[PDB]
């Protein structure tokens, strides 16, 4: 809840098909940062090449939807 803006309990109990995370307000910007700061840290030719998980999440994103067919 505090880091990624979702309840793992909610997903276990309700198994929602989609989950939208909202990045509104101060708390939402902090959660958005956590999604952005979530990075792949690879070493290529003795150089740190940091890539982003959640490419579609930038500083102008207001939401992110996790998607599934069934849950």
């Amino acid at each position: 809840k505090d880091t990624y803006g979702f309840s793992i309990l909610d997903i276990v109990i309700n198994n929602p098909v989609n989950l939208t995370i909202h990045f509104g307000g101060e708390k939402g910007k902090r959660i958005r940062e956590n999604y952005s700061a979530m990075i792949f840290e690879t070493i290529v030719d003795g150089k740190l090449k940091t890539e982003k998980i959640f490419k579609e999440i930038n500083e102008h994103s207001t939401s992110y939807t996790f998607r599934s067919e069934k849950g």
């Binding site: 909202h22 509104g24 307000g25 101060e26 959660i31 939401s63």
Partner: protein, 145 residues
């Protein structure tokens, strides 16, 4: 509320004040309660409040001025209470907008007012002004204060 001075404030004005103030606070309150019941702390609703430069300047408008001035408390209440994550406050001080239910009775003089180097608005322009408050940059600004 037209032709309702202080001494005429009665049923209609109390009802108008319920519409234009009290039940706006209740509507905001209801949205706050729904969001909080569902744990929504990161998707605040921007409240575009129809504020007025008319705080008893024209007269004869019942409790209009009281309704409009009372909305200005929300600017402070946003900081002092516990609803800031559910609602943001955007106070639009709406200028002289020709053609509306409230202002159509004042259309004939607007050319004269503009000779002072002042601006009256069409409903289209005012709508455009208010839609400017719902742009991503103003939305982010109201989330800060």
């Amino acid at each position: 509320e037209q032709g309702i001075e202080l001494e005429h404030i009665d049923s209609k004005s109390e009802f108008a004040h319920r519409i234009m103030l009290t039940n706006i606070l209740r509507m905001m309150g209801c949205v706050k309660k729904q969001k909080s019941a569902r744990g929504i702390e990161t998707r605040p609703a921007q409240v575009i409040l129809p504020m007025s430069p008319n705080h008893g300047t024209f007269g004869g408008d019942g409790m209009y001025s009281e309704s409009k001035l009372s909305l200005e408390t929300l600017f402070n209440r946003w900081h002092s209470e516990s609803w800031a994550n559910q609602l943001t406050v955007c106070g639009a001080i709406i200028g002289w907008t020709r053609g509306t239910g409230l202002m159509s009775a004042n259309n004939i003089i607007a050319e004269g007012i503009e000779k002072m180097g002042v601006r009256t608005f069409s409903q289209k322009e005012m709508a455009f002004n208010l839609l400017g408050l719902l742009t991503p940059e103003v939305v982010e600004l109201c989330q800060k204060s």
